[PDB]
Structure 1
Amino acid sequence: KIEEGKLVIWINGDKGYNGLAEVGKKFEKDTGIKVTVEHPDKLEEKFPQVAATGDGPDIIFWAHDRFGGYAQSGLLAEITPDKAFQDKLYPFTWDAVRYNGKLIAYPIAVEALSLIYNKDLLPNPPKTWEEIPALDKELKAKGKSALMFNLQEPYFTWPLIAADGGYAFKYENGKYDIKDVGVDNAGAKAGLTFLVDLIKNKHMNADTDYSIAEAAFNKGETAMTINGPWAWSNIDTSKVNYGVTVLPTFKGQPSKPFVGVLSAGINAASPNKELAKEFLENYLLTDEGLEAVNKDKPLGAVALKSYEEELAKDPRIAATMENAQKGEIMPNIPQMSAFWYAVRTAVINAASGRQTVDAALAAAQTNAAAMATLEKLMKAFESLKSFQQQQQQQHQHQHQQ
């Protein structure tokens, strides 16, 4: 149920879909083609099912990392924007929407971790990681702590680990090299050691999670926290005078958080590919098009240079973009599952004292190959099931041989 001569668009419920419909309303007035915007529950899981059969939306809006799995399954169509339109967006955002050399989606919004500080407790935020231990002792005299952030998830701790030479997958020649993993290098060694040093010197607690860290900052117990744009609304409600700035540097090198890019992909089964190209390139990815969506729900930092400069007036957004350009793009390959599994264990075991930094990171490459073996055989058996599925419609109590 695609239906040619019209566009049906899928976008998550927490996004500005009403403003997107306004863009589609503008699109209808110029070309005479109606645009329907739908927001079904769990559309990221519904899409691969329906798009395989040849159904689903013409355009889908989701994070770029999930789009890699779609392009693997051949559900997304290769987009054809020329050199001039590619210059309209930030050059790095184009790397997020790439699979097997081909461009598969249009970058819309950019999301990344930033440093959030209490202005009343600390009007001058630190530029380096190394001055935070010294800052903690000075704030402990006033019954406060310098920095509290989520330590359970690798996503939050990676900016430090990365900062000086850490890397999950080496991005070279428009592709990720799965044979080159930078979790066991000297840069990642130093970053995690510094984090562990912060813990054993009582500057941070190893048991700290999202709930503990958010509550601590919103009550004004800690001076600084590391969080994304999604948490801004909760800090606004707590009346806390907060600022958002660039992440602290480690060994003179900037922190490298993972970059999440909200993207627009065209279904491969769609017979409205050139119409989707017209809508996305010339109606949505313009100053008006993004403004209409942003006013319904804030898009944060955007991929379009012209409108990003406009939004930059908000220093929070400017910091989101600055950390993103200093960070690295979330790899869209399936091998990322094994990476998260390995690094999560690595960080937890290093922080708790179960394993040393050198040993915890070394075991990560072993543990990553382990998840790979489980996954490579996980889908080997679901394939065996599907082979015996067809062996029931060919030769049975209905037709033999």
Structure 2
Amino acid sequence: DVTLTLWSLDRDIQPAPNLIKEFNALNNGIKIEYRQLQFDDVVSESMRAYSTGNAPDIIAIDNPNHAMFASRGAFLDVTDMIAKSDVIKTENYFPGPLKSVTWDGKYFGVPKATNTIALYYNKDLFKAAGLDAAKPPQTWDELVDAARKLTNPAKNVYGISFSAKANEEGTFQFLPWAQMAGATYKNINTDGAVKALETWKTLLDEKLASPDTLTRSQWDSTATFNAGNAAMAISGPWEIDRMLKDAKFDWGVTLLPVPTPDAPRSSAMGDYNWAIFSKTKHPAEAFKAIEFFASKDKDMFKNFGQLPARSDIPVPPTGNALKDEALKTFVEQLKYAQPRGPSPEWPKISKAIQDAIQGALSGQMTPKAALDQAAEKIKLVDG
């Protein structure tokens, strides 16, 4: 057998290790060995290994990071193998995810999945508060007022859970708010962005969300929602399968609230891409693995609660009512997602935003001053 290595942050209930077991059962002359990483080490460990000369054959890399690796020669050019494939067809992919694997008019990967965030809410807690569980918040003012009402320290319930962590988590969570208010990462200090950050400050200052929001991932924040300790959660479709097992209450999912009713929804394009490292000894076999993964995209939502990056396979209902309402909301919200980049410098853009968020939420800087500084940094690093 040819033995390949594959690195991903996917855990046991997530696609990669399960796809790998199915691939290995084919006994097709190829075997894959898996390494499970943490979010915060996918880039660092990946780039260390490539620099050291022992990168894996395959990685699942977060879409905003793809351009850095591709621009640096770390990823194999898969343009010609994609052209020969009928399993992997560029026509199948949503434009944004496909663009994220491209660099200099060549393909340097294949999208794995796509996502964005939306608003989960605990319908039982809504009802108990005298709110209308059929009419979740539509505006930021409604969201904040609901969060005030639903904050119940007597039962250690926060009105909302989210993430402002000083890494990609916080940037991915903030950009929708800023974008809905008219800003972009290229123009992050508009008055609307300032209002977004002031609104985050309210959620924390008024103890409507945990102080741990500043240091905790979306995944770990949502676990508190599942446990009944946050009435609402801003997170992605990757929560669904775990939520169905863990949340012991009735829940719904709605579009992200907007700053005023005349503002359209907007968010950041989430999820990962497959890539092959450029010095693989086994390019054909690694590509065949990726083809096998793509051939199973049709079953990703039913098996894992994640969404394919593809227009050719619209996701069918599962038959689970909670899961299917989640699907409907996320499929809609996804249409309004915007890419982070392309930029080989994405981490520096994101750090500027992260620093603004931390500075304002701590009270050390005003939102305006924090974001003005981020915008200055971004002018430099995004040039």
TM range (shorter): 0.7 to 0.9
Cα pair 1:11 1:17 within 8 Å, conserved:
no
- Which ranges of structure 2 fall in alignment gaps of 5 or more residues? 127-132
Structure 2 letter corresponding to 1:192: L
Deviations 1:303-331 (A, max 9, x none): 13344423676332443343333222233
Structure 2 letter corresponding to 1:35: I
The alignment partner of 1:244 has SS state of strand
Q: 1:227 to 1:293 in 2, by over 3 A?
A: closer
The partner residue of 1:363 within 364, 367, 373 is 373
The partner residue of 2:6 within 10, 23, 36 is 10
The partner residue of 1:228 within 225, 228, 236 is 236
RMSD value, Cα: 3.8
Q: CA deviation at 1:93?
A: 1.5
Q: 2 CA distance for matches of 1:132 and 1:18?
A: 38
The partner residue of 2:308 within 278, 302, 305 is 302
Q: 1:309 to 1:293 in 2, by over 3 A?
A: closer
Is 1:217 the equivalent of 2:225?
A: yes
What does residue 130 of structure 2 align with? none
1:69-80 aligned within 5 A: 69-80=68-79
What does residue 64 of structure 1 align with? 63
What does residue 167 of structure 1 align with? 184
Is 1:187 the equivalent of 2:192?
A: yes
Is 1:325 the equivalent of 2:335?
A: yes
Is 1:109 the equivalent of 2:117?
A: no
What does residue 346 of structure 2 align with? 336
What does residue 297 of structure 2 align with? 290
Cα pair 2:162 2:234 within 8 Å, conserved:
yes
Cα pair 1:105 1:266 within 8 Å, conserved:
yes
What does residue 37 of structure 1 align with? 32
Q: 1:279 to 1:207 in 2, by over 3 A?
A: closer
Q: 2 CA distance for matches of 1:367 and 1:189?
A: 16
Structure 2 letter corresponding to 1:236: K
Q: 2 CA distance for matches of 1:111 and 1:55?
A: 30
Structure 1 letter corresponding to 2:141: E
What does residue 171 of structure 1 align with? none
Query: Larger deviation: 41-50 or 100-109?
Result: 41-50
Cα pair 2:147 2:208 within 8 Å, conserved:
no
Structure 1 letter corresponding to 2:19: G
Deviations 1:193-220 (A, max 9, x none): 44445666x4735835148954753453
Is 1:149 the equivalent of 2:152?
A: no
What does residue 376 of structure 1 align with? none
Deviations 1:347-398 (A, max 9, x none): 233334433332221122345589x6xxxxxxxxxxxxxxxxxxxxxxxxxx
Q: 2 CA distance for matches of 1:52 and 1:136?
A: 47
Q: CA deviation at 1:118?
A: 0.6
The alignment partner of 1:192 has SS state of helix
- Which ranges of structure 1 fall in alignment gaps of 5 or more residues? 29-33, 169-180, 373-401
Q: 1:264 to 1:7 in 2, by over 3 A?
A: farther
What does residue 379 of structure 1 align with? none
Structure 2 letter corresponding to 1:336: W
Is 1:128 the equivalent of 2:135?
A: no
Q: CA deviation at 1:126?
A: 1.9
Corresponding pairs, count: 345
Cα pair 1:16 1:294 within 8 Å, conserved:
no
Structure 1 letter corresponding to 2:160: L
Q: 1:344 to 1:154 in 2, by over 3 A?
A: same
Deviations 1:136-179 (A, max 9, x none): 465569987643433453432332122122222xxxxxxxxxxx
